[PDB]
Amino acid sequence: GMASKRALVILAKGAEEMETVIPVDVMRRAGIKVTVAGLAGKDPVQCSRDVVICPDASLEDAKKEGPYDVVVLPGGNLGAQNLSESAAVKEILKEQENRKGLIAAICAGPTALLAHEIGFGSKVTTHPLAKDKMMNGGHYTYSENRVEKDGLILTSRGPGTSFEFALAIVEALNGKEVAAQVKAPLVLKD
């Protein structure tokens, strides 16, 4: 039926586990083929609140199996720092931007866009506490929307916006009707 879509979720030590799992799960509910790729390799990843998640693949392997319809950056302060320090992440994000592919980042995650000089001049949001880091240099325009989207740059604010973020990714890739169908069984407040 509809075109098959693929997502790369880059999972670093210190990632916010809720911001990782909610988008993975919701995107799989939408029929997206999601690869959870460990930044450091295939070993289990210790997230910010000590949930330990086993990646589907190393980033080293997953990066060779693209391209992807979306690249997703969870937050977590230390996770986002790790993403920001990675040359592999830099290369993946630059390729995705060049290809006009969706890039989605939540909470502190968008600060890795700054680190890798991705999407300058777009409207973005972040966690309130990550605003100052994101806005250093004035390279983006800040938004307080729970989810923000400016062209191919899709951002969101925190654990409590993760469902909205995920469903925005679904809407961008598979359309509004799929997003609405996936949303209904979740028992979201609105």
Going by CATH, the architecture would be 3-Layer(aba) Sandwich
CATH top-level class: Alpha Beta
The CATH homology group name: Class I glutamine amidotransferase (GATase) domain
Secondary structure class reads alpha/beta
* Total of domains: 1
Strand arrangement in the largest pleated sheet: 5-2-1-6-7-11-10
Q: What's the helical proportion of residues?
A: 25-40%
What profile does the largest beta sheet have?
Answer: 7 strands, mixed
CATH names the topology as: Rossmann fold
Helical segment tally? 8
What report would you give on this structure?
- The protein is an alpha/beta fold and 190 residues long.
- The protein has a single domain (1-190), classed as Rossmann fold, CATH 3.40.50.880.
- The chain is built from eight helices and eleven strands.
- The protein has helices at 17-29, 59-62, 77-84, 87-98, 111-115, 131-134, 162-174, 176-183, and strands at 6-11, 33-38, 45-46, 52-53, 57-58, 70-73, 102-106, 123-124, 141-142, 147-150, 153-156.
- The strands form three sheets. A seven-stranded mixed sheet has the order 5-2-1-6-7-11-10, with helices on both faces.
- Helix 1 packs parallel to helix 7 (162-174) and helix 7 (162-174) packs antiparallel against helix 8 (176-183).
- The longest helix has 13 residues, at 17-29.
- The protein is globular, with a radius of gyration of 15 Å.
- It is classed as chaperone.
- The entry lists the keywords Joint Center for Structural Genomics, jcsg, Protein Structure Initiative, Partnership for Nuclear Receptor Signaling Code Biology, NHRs, Partnership for T-Cell Biology, tcell, PSI-biology, chaperone.
- It forms a monomeric assembly.
- The entry is titled "Crystal structure of a DJ-1 (PARK7) from Homo sapiens at 1.23 A resolution".
- The protein is Protein deglycase DJ-1.
